Write a protein that binds this ligand. Structure first.
Ligand code: NI
Length: 341
């Protein structure tokens, strides 16, 4: 049955709640972003109103074939009325099209649902600064102090400099980047830009990217693999067997692979600086795991919450075990005593 942390009190609304069948009393289903753990259940046969960003609504229509008449895209940073309730969508700094949702309840309560987010000081200057938030439905994916990671900018600098050096030393090396969902597009686009190449990919992944309103995308991506020296493959194929196989298919055009796996976190971060990352190598194949995250680090999350000062926090991730839930609640209390709210 639908869990309570997917339901918005004082409304008929749910958030990211498409796999429970007809939720009793639900008048509007919001979708924060196009990741499968959140959209699971949507299809061309869904006949209730879905509220989302423009980009998410492009992906709904084109990838899942949801009918247009049930897709209700909203502009960002704009006060809108849904079934008599004021709402605002804000940029979540997650994947393309991903939003946070502010709900202004008829009784005066204000609720923020972060969806999935990577907290940033730029959010301290959005429409969130303009009123008090009483309840926060928080993406707690990395809510424990061991989760540190570098900025996205530092990680992309490492990736660009590594690829540029490799291919200038060996003009016959191929660069491969893994993916399994939307998100993290800067990794492969930034490398193709420094190399003077388009990114080559499957027809299905090219279609997905053409839904994202990314400026000058026709200039950076292609389905012609022959004309490209940066290839995108499914994340499952980013291993020595899968890469050796791919290299066979390129017909002697290339004699080396440099591959990137943008993971969220890996425990090499507790010790290792970004400067100190090394690949796994077998033969003429090297694989780099880079810590490119689209979720808040522990410190990023803590700063956002200590700035917002919510009256009540509802975690939406890691809620399945009693030790996880109790540990998160103890961090929330620390933050509140340290900050004075
Ligand atoms: Ni997500």
């Amino acid at each position: 049955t639908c869990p309570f942390y997917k339901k918005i009190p004082g409304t008929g609304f749910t958030v990211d709640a498409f796999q429970y069948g007809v939720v009793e009393g639900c008048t509007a289903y919001f979708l924060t972003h196009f990741h499968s753990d959140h959209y699971a259940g949507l299809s061309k046969h869904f006949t209730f109103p879905v509220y989302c960003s423009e980009i998410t609504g492009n992906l709904l229509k084109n990838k899942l074939h949801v009918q247009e008449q049930y897709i209700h895209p909203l502009p960002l940073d704009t006060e809108c009325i849904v079934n008599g309730v004021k709402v605002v969508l804000l940029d979540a700094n997650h994947c393309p099209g991903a939003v946070m949702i502010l709900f202004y309840l008829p009784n005066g309560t204000v609720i923020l649902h972060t969806g999935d987010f990577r907290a940033d000081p730029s959010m301290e200057r959005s429409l969130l600064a303009d009123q008090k938030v009483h309840m926060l439905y928080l993406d707690t994916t990395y809510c424990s102090p061991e989760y540190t990671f570098p900025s996205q900018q530092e990680v992309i600098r490492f990736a660009i400099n590594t690829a540029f050096e490799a291919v200038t030393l060996n003009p016959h090396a191929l660069v491969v980047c893994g993916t399994y969902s939307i998100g993290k597009e800067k990794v492969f686009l930034a490398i193709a830009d420094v190399l003077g190449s388009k990114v080559g990919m499957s027809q299905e992944k090219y279609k997905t990217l053409q839904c994202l309103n990314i400026p000058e995308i026709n200039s950076l991506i292609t389905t012609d693999m022959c004309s490209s020296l940066v290839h995108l493959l499914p994340m499952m194929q980013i291993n020595f067997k899968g890469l050796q196989s791919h290299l066979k298919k390129c017909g002697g055009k290339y004699n080396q692979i440099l591959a990137f796996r943008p993971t969220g976190w890996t425990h090499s971060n507790k010790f290792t600086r970004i400067a100190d990352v090394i690949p796994q190598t077998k033969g003429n194949i090297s694989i780099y795991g880079i810590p490119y995250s689209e979720h808040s680090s522990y410190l990023e999350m803590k700063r956002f919450v200590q700035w917002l000062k919510p009256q009540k926090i509802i975690p939406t991730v890691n809620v399945g075990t009693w030790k996880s839930r109790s540990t998160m609640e103890k961090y929330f209390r620390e933050w509140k005593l340290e900050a004075g709210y």
